[PDB]
Design a protein around this ligand. Structure first.
Ligand SMILES: Nc1ncnc2c1ncn2[C@@H]1O[C@H](CSCC[C@H](N)C(=O)O)[C@@H](O)[C@H]1O
Ligand SMILES: CN1Cc2cccc3c2N(CC3)C1=N
Length: 256
């Protein structure tokens, strides 16, 4: 199973962004999936009452898509990833470097969902202002953020990280439990991940994925000290050239 070190040495941020996050007019398997992610995080952060002071984004990677709706609902967003190269691609965009991956097609989409109330530039600035901290992360450590002092967060968020980072269920259950120590009692856990997947490709590079189904995930969540507000499962898959998932699940949980 892909080790931590192989995320430091082989995970290619720009490569990954190109492969998965170039909102393309040709209706790819990747595009449709992004569209669906975007719609859930909208429903969760805008339509529903999931809001608060502090959100912690677990396993951010180089990507900002999952923070776009959340920035409407939280004052303070911290972003975390295990890999230094990854945090460096984020910061590019945070700094609005002209070398930063181009997100406007995604920003366009979200602004639409929220009924065009704002424009790309004013959506972007909101996120920029919202992100206070960019930190090293390890979901396997009982203190994932290590030393860094943080108040208890209202919400922990994780998109397609926990599958990537957890070799087994024991460890997967440990990770959730670790995230929970950053969360208030009654705090929000929002996870979105692949169902029944063993690998995913960034270019030529193959990264492991923990193949778990609907049941195992829900079980792991209860064990870690959470109750599930809601749990969703969609058929849509990635291109066969890229991963072997059967679908995706989204959930909102609450800590005890
Ligand atoms: N032990 C660990 N702790 C924290 N993050 C880890 C980790 N092992 C891997 N990761 C991170 O998990 C991410 C999986 S890729 C998903 C990135 C982003 N959330 C998205 O939706 O596309 C990578 O950025 C990798 O650095
Ligand atoms: C964006 N993808 C696509 C994907 C598909 C399947 C499995 C996994 C992924 N992961 C992590 C695990 C990603 N980061």
């Amino acid at each position: 199973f892909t080790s931590k070190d192989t995320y430091l040495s082989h995970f290619n941020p720009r490569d990954y962004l190109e492969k998965y996050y170039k909102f393309g007019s040709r209706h790819s398997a990747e595009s449709q999936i992004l569209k669906h992610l975007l719609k859930n995080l909208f429903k969760i952060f805008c339509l529903d009452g999931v809001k608060g002071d502090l959100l912690i984004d677990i396993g951010s990677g180089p990507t900002i898509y999952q923070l776009l709706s959340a920035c409407e609902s939280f004052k303070e967003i911290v972003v975390t990833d295990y890999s230094d190269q990854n945090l460096q691609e984020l910061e590019k965009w945070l700094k609005a470097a002209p070398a930063a991956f181009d997100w406007s097609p995604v920003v366009t989409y979200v602004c639409d969902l929220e009924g065009n109330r704002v424009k790309g530039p004013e959506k972007e600035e909101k996120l920029r202002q919202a992100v206070k901290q960019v930190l090293k992360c390890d979901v396997t450590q009982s203190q994932p953020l290590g030393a860094v002092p943080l108040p208890p967060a209202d919400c922990v968020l994780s998109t397609l990280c926990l599958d990537a980072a957890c070799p087994d269920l024991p460890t997967y259950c440990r990770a959730l439990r670790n995230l929970g120590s950053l969360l208030k009692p009654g705090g929000f856990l929002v996870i979105m991940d692949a169902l029944k997947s063993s690998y995913y490709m960034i270019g030529e590079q193959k990264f492991s994925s923990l193949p778990l189904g609907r049941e195992a995930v829900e079980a792991a969540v209860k064990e870690a000290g959470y109750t599930i507000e809601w749990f969703e499962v969609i058929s849509q898959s990635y291109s066969s050239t890229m991963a072997n998932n059967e679908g995706l699940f989204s959930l909102v949980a609450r800590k005890l």
